[PDB]
Specification:
The structure is cut from a larger assembly and holds 8 protein chains of 7 kinds. Chain C is of the alpha+beta class and 248 residues long. Chain C is 27% helix and 21% strand. In chain C, the strands form 2 sheets. Chain C has a 5-stranded antiparallel beta sheet. Chain C starts with 14 loop residues before the first strand and ends with a helix. In chain E, strands 1-2 form a two-stranded antiparallel ribbon. Chain E starts with a strand and ends with a helix. The chains are: A mainly beta (339), B mainly beta (48), C alpha+beta (248), E mainly alpha (108), F mainly alpha (196), G mainly alpha (122), H mainly alpha (48). The complex binds zinc ion. Zinc ion binds next to loops of chain C. The site of zinc ion has 6 residues of chain C, from loops. The structure holds one RNA strand of 92 nucleotides. The PDB classes it as splicing/rna.
RNA sequence: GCCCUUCGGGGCAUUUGGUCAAUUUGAAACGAUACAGAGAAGAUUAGCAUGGCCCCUGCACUAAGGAUGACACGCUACUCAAAGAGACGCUA
C-alpha cells in the first residue's frame, strides 16, 4: 500500500475570503456571451457573443463603447495584447483575426484551422498566439508573419482550452477527449499527458504567483503542479459541466457551471467558501441558465461573467462581510478519501 | 573502416563537398505523395 | 550530410572532389527524394559519374554501400547475401508500406534498431556436408570412323547436371574447330558437330569411346545428328547407367 | 561444501554450485547455468526491481517513450502531493 | 539456498524464506519461466469455446423468438419490425390511451 | 489467394471508410485468424488499438483471440498491457486473475492480485483475493490480506468479515483483537461518537 | 553454362556463366533472325519452376557467398570452420583449451578477429 | 462467378491464363502485411 | 610558348564534363466503337455540406465548378446472465 502523510499539515486551513454578490447585468448582446478580455490597463473589457459581434465595454460604467463586426460565426476567443495595440479574436467560422486597436479594423488573418476555433492565448513574453479547435489541433502562430509555426497534435477530441505561460510547460491544452496535454513550445512535442479526468476537459487556468495550474471537467476540478504535472488536489462539490475557472491574485478559484451554477473556492486549501446559482435575464428559459465565459479584471476585485441568457454579470466581493459574519465551516476530517 | 572482405588499413581521406550547380529554370522534380498517418505516440495509462 | 560509400567505389585518389545535391534523385528502393552525393571515378576523361544510388535509411536497412548496392561485410549482392544466409530483410518491400515504414521508423533505424557473423560459419558448415542387364564395354566399332564421310556428329551420354557446356567446349577445342555443341542436361545428351572430319576422327582416336571430364564419366560415339525430344525417364536412367558403365 | 578448501570435489550436479557461481579453486570448466550452445534469442524485456523490491511494471507504460516524458502509471500519482508520504516542503514558486 | 529447512527445538521441519520470491512470484524474475501444462491450456481453450457456443446459442434463440408473427402487424421490413417493437417497449406506458382510442373507433 | 486479396481489400476499404466502428476491425481480425495468419491478425488488432486505445471490449477480444490459439505468453503480455493502460477497469483484472488461475500458476495469480491490491480496488477484488487464498488453504496470508483490506476499506462491514473469518479459521483471541482494533480505529478516525 | 531448348514451343532459356554476357546476348539477339526471316523475342527469363533448377540456383548462390566468406576469413580460421580435415579438427581441440581443460571454446571467442582477441588473430 | 467458371474451363484445357485485377491507384494487400504494427514485447518470451 | 637571369637557374599558365547522336524491350494520353445510364421513402427536380491511400479544371494550397464531381446505400454471435418449477433422467 502507498503510504499517506499523517502529519495533519497536508490539509492547509483555508484563508477567509468575503462572499461575492451581483453588481451588474449588461444587455445588448443577441447571442450567448462566450468571450471576455480585459485590457492590460483595466479600463475596458471585450465580450464576444453568438451574434458574431465583439463589444467593447467600459469597465467602470458598464457602458457600451463600441461594436465590431467581421466574424460570421460565434466569437469564442479574444485577447488584448499587453505589448501591442492588438486584439485577437477567434470564431466558429475557422477565422483567427488580429484587430488593430488604433484603427478598429482587422489587419491580420491566421488561417489554417479546419473547423471552428474555441481558444486563443497570447504568450506572455513571446510574440506568439495559440488557438485550438474542433480539429484536435493546437495551432501555434507567429504574430508578425501569420505563419503556423507549430501544429500540436495528439488530442483525439476538440481542444477546448489552453494556457500560455513563460516557463515549460509553455502550452497546456485540455480537450474533450478527457485528456490534458503539456507541451514544450520550442519543439512542438508533448511533455506530458494527464488522464485523470473522466469527461471532456473544458476549463483551464494558471495561478498568477504560484507555478501551478488547474483543469476542470464536469463534477471535478483538479489542481496540478508544474513542470512535472503532479496532482496537487481536488476541488469537489460542483456537480455540473464546468465551463470556466478564475483564480485571483488573492487566491480565488471561480468555477461556472453550465446549468447556471457558481462555486468560489480558496485556492490553497480547496475549500469552497461560496456556492451560488445565477439568475436569468427576464424572458429567458430555465435551460438558458448558464455561465459560459468568465474572467477577472486586472485588479481582481470584479468578476465578469458572460452568460447564456446573453448577459454580462459583474460580481463584487462583499465589503460588509467579516470572518464572524461568514465563518469558515471547514474541519480537518479524518477520512480515507478513496482515490 | 574495414569492409567487403579485406581488412587492410586504407589511408584516411580529405573530401571536398560542394553543392551542385542547379539549372535556375528547372521545375520541381518529383510529385508529392499522400501517405497515410502513422500511429500516434503510445498512449498513457488511464488514471481515473 | 555525408554518404556511406565503400572504398572501392571511392576514387583511388585520397582527396575526393564531391558534388552534393539536396533531393537530387529518388532512392532506388523506397522512391523517396534524398541527398545525392556524386564524384568522378578513376576512369578520367570519360566514364560514368558515380553517385549514391540509394538513400541512407535504405543503406542502413540493407547494410550496403550507397553506390554499388553490395553488402558492406563480404562484398556480396544484397539478394545473394539474403538467400544464402536466410536473413530477415528488416523492412517491407511493397509500394505504400515502404513509405509507411520509413516515415514511422527513420529515428530507430539510424540508431541500429528494427550482425550476421555466426550465420556465415553456419553456411560454411552446411556446405561442408554438401550432399549434392548392363550394356557391355564399348567395342572397337564405337570409335572407328564410319565409311560415310557425311557422318559428323559425336554423341555424348552420361552428362550430369554439374557439368557446364564450357568445360566440354574447351575440352574438345584442343582437337579442332567446333561448329556446334548441344548439351541437354535434362536428357543427359550431347551432340558435337565439328567443321572438319579430321577433328572428329582425332576425337574418336584419342577418346576411344570413353571420357572423364571434371570427374564425370561420359561415353562418346559417332552419330548422325538427330534431335532430342520429350523422352521417357526410364530411358534417361538407363543411358545414365550406360554412361556410368563407360568406366566399368 | 564449505570453504576452508574445496579440492577433490568436482561439481557434477547443477545444484552443486548452490544457487550458482563457479568455484575458482577447481581448475575445470564449470557451467552454473548449463550449456550456452544456442544464443538467448528471447524477445522479452529486462525485468527490473524497485527500491523496496517488487517486479517493476513501469517498463510497459514507458515502452516507446523517451526518458523525459512524464507518464503517470501508478496509484501513487492519484494521491495529493501534500499527502504523498515522502513529501515535506513543496516549492510552489515561479 | 533461497528457502532454508530448519529442524527447530520442537522437532518440526520449518522452512523460512530469505526473500519473498516463494509466496508470490513478485521479486522472482522467473515468473516468465512458468510453463502451463497441456491439460490447463486445453481447459482454458475449452471454456472460451464454451462461452463462444453459448453466445451463438443465445443469438440463435433470440432470432428464433424474433421470427414469430404473434400480434398485430404494422411494419413492412425486419428492421421496421424491430424499430416498432422498440417503439412499443418505450411508448406503451405513454400511448396506451391513444391505442384504446384507436381500437374503439371513437373518443380520444 | 484471389479470395484472400478480395476479402482483405473489402475489409481495408471498410476500415478506411469508417475506422471508428469496432465491427470492421473485429471482422477483419477474426477472418485473418481463420486462415491462421496470426501476425496479420495481431497487426490488425494493434492498429485497432491505435485507433481505440481505451476500449475494454477490443482488449478483451484480442486477449481472447490470443488465448484460443494457445499463445499463452503473448496473451499474458497483452493482459499486462491491458491492466497497465486501464488499471481501473475491474473486468480486465478479473479476466487476468481468472486466466492465470485456469493455467495453474497460483503464485502468478497471487502477484497479479498483489498489483491489483496496490491499485486499491473496490471490496469485491479484496473478497476475491481472500477467496483465492482460502481455497488453497493459506489462511495466515489471508489474514495479512484482511489487514491491508481493513486499512484500505475501513468500514464496519470489512471488520465484521474479518471477524467471521477469524471465528471460522482462528482463535477467539484473534476475534477479540479484531473487534478491539475495529472499535479503536473507528473511535480514533470518526471520533468517539460515530462508532457503529 | 546451360541452354535448355523447350522445342515444339519454339522457346529456349540460355544461361551464361556471366551476367554481362547475358545482357550482351539479350541486347544483341533481340529482333534478329536465326535461320529464316523471323523476329526473335529475346527477353529476360523469369524463374525456372523446376525444383532441380531451384536447388541448383540456391546452391550456386550458397557457394558464391561461401567464396566471399572464405576470402574474408583467414585460411586457418575457415579450415577449422569446416573441419573436413582431421588435422584441423585436432588443432581446434588442442588450441581451444587455453589452460582450462574440458572447455571447447565457443566460436564467438575462438573464431574472433581483432587486436585484443585471444587467438593468433591476424 | 462467370469469370470463375470460364477461368476453370480454360485451366482444364491445358493453358494457364494469368488473371490480373491490378487497377491503378490500388494497394497490394498480399505482398506484405498492410501497415504492419508488430505487438509490443513484454516480460514473457514469445519466440517459441 | 613567352619572360627573367648573379647562365647557377628561375617565373607565368593547372584537371572540363548529372548529356552516348542512335525511339521495338524502362513505362504518355485518349478518342471512336460497343455498353451502361445522373441523388433525397409516387413522379419531377434546385442545392449546401460532411469523411479521405479518389480526383479533374483552375493563379486561387483562405474562389467557383466538375451529376449536389464521384464515392457512402454495405455487412451484422462474443464486456453477456439470473430465477422456479416441472421433468425423460441425473443425484443426494
Ligand atoms: Zn560501393
Amino acid at each position: 500500500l502507498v503510504r499517506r502523510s499523517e502529519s495533519l499539515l497536508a490539509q492547509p486551513r483555508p484563508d477567509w475570503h468575503p462572499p461575492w454578490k451581483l453588481m451588474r447585468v449588461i444587455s445588448g448582446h443577441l447571442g450567448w456571451v462566450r468571450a471576455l478580455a480585459v485590457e492590460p490597463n483595466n479600463q475596458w473589457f471585450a465580450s464576444g457573443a453568438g451574434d458574431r459581434t465583439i463589444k467593447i465595454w467600459d469597465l467602470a460604467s458598464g457602458q457600451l463603447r463600441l461594436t465590431l463586426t467581421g466574424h460570421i460565426s460565434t466569437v469564442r476567443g479574444l485577447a488584448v495584447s499587453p505589448r501591442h495595440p492588438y486584439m485577437f479574436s477567434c470564431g466558429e467560422d475557422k477565422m483567427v483575426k488580429c484587430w488593430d486597436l488604433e484603427t478598429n479594423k482587422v489587419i491580420r488573418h491566421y488561417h489554417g484551422h479546419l473547423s471552428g476555433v474555441y481558444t486563443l492565448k497570447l504568450h506572455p513574453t513571446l510574440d506568439v498566439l495559440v488557438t485550438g479547435g474542433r480539429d484536435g489541433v493546437a495551432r501555434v502562430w507567429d504574430m508578425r508573419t501569420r505563419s503556423n509555426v507549430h501544429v500540436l497534435s495528439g488530442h483525439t477530441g476538440t481542444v477546448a482550452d489552453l494556457v500560455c505561460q513563460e516557463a515549460d510547460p509553455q502550452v497546456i491544452t485540455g480537450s474533450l477527449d478527457s485528456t490534458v496535454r503539456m507541451w514544450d513550445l520550442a519543439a512542438g512535442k508533448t511533455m506530458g499527458v494527464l488522464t485523470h479526468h473522466k469527461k471532456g476537459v473544458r476549463a483551464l487556468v494558471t495561478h498568477p504567483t504560484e507555478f501551478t495550474f488547474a483543469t476542470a471537467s464536469t463534477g471535478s476540478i483538479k489542481q496540478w503542479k508544474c513542470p512535472e504535472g503532479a496532482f496537487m488536489q481536488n476541488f469537489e462539490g460542483h456537480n455540473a459541466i464546468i465551463n470556466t475557472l478564475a483564480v485571483n491574485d488573492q487566491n480565488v478559484l471561480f468555477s461556472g457551471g453550465d446549468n447556471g451554477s457558481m462555486s468560489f473556492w480558496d485556492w490553497k486549501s480547496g475549500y469552497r467558501f461560496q456556492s451560488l446559482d445565477t439568475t436569468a435575464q427576464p424572458g429567458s428559459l430555465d435551460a438558458e441558465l448558464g455561465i459560459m465565459s468568465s474572467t477577472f479584471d486586472m485588479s481582481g476585485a470584479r468578476l465578469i461573467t458572460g452568460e447564456a441568457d446573453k448577459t454580462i454579470k459583474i460580481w463584487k466581493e462583499d465589503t460588509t462581510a467579516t470572518p464572524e459574519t461568514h465563518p469558515i465551516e471547514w474541519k480537518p476530517s479524518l477520512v480515507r478519501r478513496k482515490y | 573502416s574495414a569492409q567487403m572482405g579485406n581488412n587492410t588499413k586504407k589511408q584516411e581521406r580529405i573530401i571536398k563537398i560542394v553543392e551542385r550547380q542547379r539549372d535556375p529554370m528547372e521545375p520541381p522534380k518529383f510529385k508529392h505523395k499522400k501517405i497515410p498517418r502513422g500511429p500516434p505516440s503510445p498512449p498513457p495509462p488511464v488514471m481515473h | 550530410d555525408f554518404p556511406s560509400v565503400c572504398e572501392n567505389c571511392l576514387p583511388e585518389n585520397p582527396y575526393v572532389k564531391m558534388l552534393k545535391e539536396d533531393y537530387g534523385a529518388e532512392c532506388k528502393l523506397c522512391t523517396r527524394p534524398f541527398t545525392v552525393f556524386s564524384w568522378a571515378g578513376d576512369g578520367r576523361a570519360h566514364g560514368r559519374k558515380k553517385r549514391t544510388n540509394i538513400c541512407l535509411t535504405c543503406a542502413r536497412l540493407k547494410n550496403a554501400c550507397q553506390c554499388c548496392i553490395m553488402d558492406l561485410q563480404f562484398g556480396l549482392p544484397i539478394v545473394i547475401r539474403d538467400k544464402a544466409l536466410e536473413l530477415i530483410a528488416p523492412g517491407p518491400q511493397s509500394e505504400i508500406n515502404r513509405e509507411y515504414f520509413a516515415q514511422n521508423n527513420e529515428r530507430a533505424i539510424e540508431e541500429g534498431r528494427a550482425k550476421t557473423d555466426e550465420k556465415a560459419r553456419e553456411l560454411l558448415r552446411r556446405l561442408a556436408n554438401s550432399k549434392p542387364a548392363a550394356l557391355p564395354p564399348p567395342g572397337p566399332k564405337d570409335w572407328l570412323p564410319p565409311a560415310d564421310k557425311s557422318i559428323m556428329s559425336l554423341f555424348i551420354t552420361g552428362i550430369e547436371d554439374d557439368l557446364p557446356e564450357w568445360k566440354i567446349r574447351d575440352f574438345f577445342k584442343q582437337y579442332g574447330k567446333i561448329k556446334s555443341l548441344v548439351v541437354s542436361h535434362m536428357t543427359h545428351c550431347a551432340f558435337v558437330n565439328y567443321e572438319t572430319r579430321e577433328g572428329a576422327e582425332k576425337a574418336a582416336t584419342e577418346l576411344k569411346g570413353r571420357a572423364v571430364i571434371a570427374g564425370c564419366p561420359l561415353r562418346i560415339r559417332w552419330s548422325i545428328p538427330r534431335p532430342i525430344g520429350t523422352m521417357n525417364k526410364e530411358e534417361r536412367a538407363e543411358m545414365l547407367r550406360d554412361g556410368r558403365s563407360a568406366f566399368p | 561444501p564449505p570453504y576452508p578448501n574445496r579440492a577433490g570435489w568436482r561439481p557434477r550436479a547443477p545444484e552443486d554450485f548452490g544457487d550458482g557461481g563457479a568455484f575458482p579453486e577447481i581448475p575445470v570448466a564449470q557451467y552454473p547455468w548449463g550449456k550456452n550452445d544456442s544464443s538467448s534469442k528471447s524477445n522479452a524485456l529486462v525485468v527490473q526491481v524497485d527500491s523496496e523490491g517488487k517486479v517493476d511494471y513501469t517498463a510497459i507504460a514507458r515502452q516507446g517513450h523517451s526518458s523525459d516524458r512524464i507518464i503517470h502509471a501508478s496509484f501513487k500519482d492519484l494521491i495529493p502531493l501534500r499527502q504523498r508520504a515522502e513529501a515535506g516542503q513543496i516549492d510552489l514558486s515561479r | 539456498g533461497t528457502l532454508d529447512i530448519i529442524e527447530t527445538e520442537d522437532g518440526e521441519m520449518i522452512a523460512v524464506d530469505k526473500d519473498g520470491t516463494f509466496f508470490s512470484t513478485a521479486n522472482a524474475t522467473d515468473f516468465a519461466q512458468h510453463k502451463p501444462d497441456k491439460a490447463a491450456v486445453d481447459r482454458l481453450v475449452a471454456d472460451l469455446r464454451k462461452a463462444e457456443e453459448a453466445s451463438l446459442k443465445r443469438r440463435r434463440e433470440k432470432l428464433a423468438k424474433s421470427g414469430e408473427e404473434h400480434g398485430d402487424v404494422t411494419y413492412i421490413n425486419e428492421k421496421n419490425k424491430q424499430f416498432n417493437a422498440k417503439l412499443a417497449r418505450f411508448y406503451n406506458k405513454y400511448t396506451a390511451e391513444i391505442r384504446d382510442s384507436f381500437e374503439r373507433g371513437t373518443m380520444v | 489467394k484471389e479470395y484472400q486479396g478480395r476479402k482483405r481489400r473489402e475489409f481495408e476499404d471498410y476500415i478506411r471508410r469508417n475506422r471508428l466502428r469496432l465491427q470492421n476491425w473485429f471482422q477483419y481480425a477474426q477472418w485473418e485468424l481463420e486462415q491462421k495468419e496470426f501476425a496479420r491478425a495481431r497487426s490488425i488488432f494493434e492498429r485497432a488499438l491505435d485507433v481505440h486505445p481505451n476500449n475494454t471490449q477490443l482488449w478483451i477480444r484480442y486477449i481472447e483471440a490470443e488465448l484460443k490459439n494457445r499463445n499463452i505468453n503473448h496473451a499474458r503480455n497483452l493482459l499486462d498491457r491491458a491492466v497497465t493502460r486501464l488499471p481501473r477497469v475491474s473486468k480486465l483484472w478479473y479476466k487476468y486473475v481468472y486466466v492465470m488461475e485456469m493455467l495453474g500458476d497460483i503464485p502468478g495469480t497471487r502477484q497479479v492480485f498483489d498489483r491489483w491490491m496496490k491499485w486499491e480496488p473496490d471490496e469485491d477484488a479484496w473478497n476475491a483475493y481472500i477467496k483465492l487464498e482460502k481455497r488453497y488453504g493459506e489462511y495466515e496470508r489471508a489474514r495479512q490480506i484482511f489487514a491491508a483490506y481493513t486499512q484500505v476499506h475501513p468500514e464496519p462491514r470489512t471488520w465484521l468479515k474479518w471477524a467471521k473469518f477469524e471465528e471460522e479459521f482462528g482463535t477467539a483471541d484473534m476475534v477479540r483483537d479484531v473487534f478491539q482494533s475495529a472499535i479503536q480505529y473507528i473511535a480514533e478516525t470518526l471520533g468517539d461518537d460515530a462508532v457503529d | 553454362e546451360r541452354i535448355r531448348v523447350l522445342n515444339n514451343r519454339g522457346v529456349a532459356f540460355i544461361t551464361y556463366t556471366n551476367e554481362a554476357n547475358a545482357q550482351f546476348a539479350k541486347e544483341a539477339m533481340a529482333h534478329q533472325s536465326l535461320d529464316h526471316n523471323e523476329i526473335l523475342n529475346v527477353r529476360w527469363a523469369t524463374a525456372d519452376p523446376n525444383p532441380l533448377a531451384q536447388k541448383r540456383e540456391q546452391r550456386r548462390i550458397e557457394e558464391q557467398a561461401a567464396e566471399a566468406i572464405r576470402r574474408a576469413l583467414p585460411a586457418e580460421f575457415v579450415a577449422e570452420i569446416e573441419g573436413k580435415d582431421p588435422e584441423a579438427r585436432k588443432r581446434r581441440k588442442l588450441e581451444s583449451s587455453y589452460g582450462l581443460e574440458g572447455y571447447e571454446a565457443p566460436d564467438a571467442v575462438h573464431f574472433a578477429r581483432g587486436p585484443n582477441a585471444v587467438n593468433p588473430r591476424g | 462467378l462467370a469469370a470463375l467458371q470460364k477461368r476453370r474451363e480454360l485451366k482444364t484445357a491445358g493453358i494457364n491464363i494469368k488473371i490480373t485485377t491490378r487497377k491503378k491507384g490500388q494497394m497490394d494487400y498480399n505482398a506484405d502485411i498492410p501497415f504492419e504494427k508488430k505487438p509490443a514485447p513484454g516480460f514473457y518470451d514469445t519466440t517459441e
